[PDB]
């Protein structure tokens, strides 16, 4: 398949793997979102000038572990992690 | 860890289009439409999401110059999942 097709299918596969464990298959607890980021993006780490934002982001996931997130908010979390951990965005003001 | 490469690929596609000219952190809605149509060419809406899909695509055409940042581009990919991926068939 085309590269973005494979990628977006994989973003949905990972969501199904976690959200589909039990309960509402369209929801993740933030605790499960943090688990998913930690295991599935284990090697992603903030770029040189984004440590503080990244640390605040991860901090907010712990403090609201029981709040739920839907798929669109899961994808948003992925996007934020790109802003903090992908070199393309290092100069993004 | 397949999610790593998938998320890396979402950035790569953004950079290909946003890198054409001007601000490398922005796309115009016309560019976003072009990207979704080309790069997800085989993805089509599920039976009961065709109205929503067609509405979404047509909105891009009514303000072709508006800027989309990376987070909004990723939100658009999430919308296309809701409309085109059978996992979301029961999703309100």
């Amino acid at each position: 398949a085309r590269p973005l097709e494979q990628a977006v299918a994989a973003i949905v596969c990972t969501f199904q793997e976690y959200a589909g464990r039990c309960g509402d298959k369209y929801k993740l607890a933030q605790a499960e979102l943090k688990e998913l980021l930690q295991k599935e993006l284990a090697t992603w780490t903030p770029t040189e000038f984004r440590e503080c934002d990244y640390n605040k982001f991860m901090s907010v996931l712990d403090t609201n572990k029981d709040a739920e997130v839907d798929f669109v908010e899961y994808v948003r979390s992925l996007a934020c992690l790109c802003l903090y951990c992908h070199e393309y965005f290092k100069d993004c003001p």
Side-chain angles (χ1 to χ4, degrees), chain A:
Chain A
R2 293 165 171 76
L4 194 65
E5 290 179 0
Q6 300 204 17
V8 180
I11 289 168
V12 173
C13 178
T14 301
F15 184 82
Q16 166 168 10
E17 286 172 353
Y18 287 73
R21 282 172 176 170
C22 58
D24 183 337
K25 92 170 193 168
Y26 294 127
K27 294 188 175 194
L28 282 179
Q30 278 177 223
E32 284 167 320
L33 180 61
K34 170 72 159 263
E35 185 195 349
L36 178 167
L37 300 175
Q38 280 176 357
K39 287 166 185 187
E40 305 300 327
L41 299 176
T43 65
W44 283 40
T45 61
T47 53
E48 213 178 326
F49 319 110
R50 283 284 172 219
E51 292 182 21
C52 284
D53 285 340
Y54 174 84
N55 296 339
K56 179 84 183 318
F57 179 85
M58 290 302 190
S59 260
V60 167
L61 290 178
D62 282 347
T63 69
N64 297 299
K65 276 182 241 281
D66 310 334
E68 298 181 299
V69 132
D70 64 10
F71 176 73
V72 170
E73 176 65 17
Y74 149 77
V75 169
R76 183 175 169 97
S77 297
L78 302 179
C80 293
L81 282 166
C82 293
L83 301 181
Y84 310 139
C85 302
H86 194 296
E87 213 61 51
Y88 187 70
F89 300 98
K90 188 163 140 229
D91 295 338
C92 183

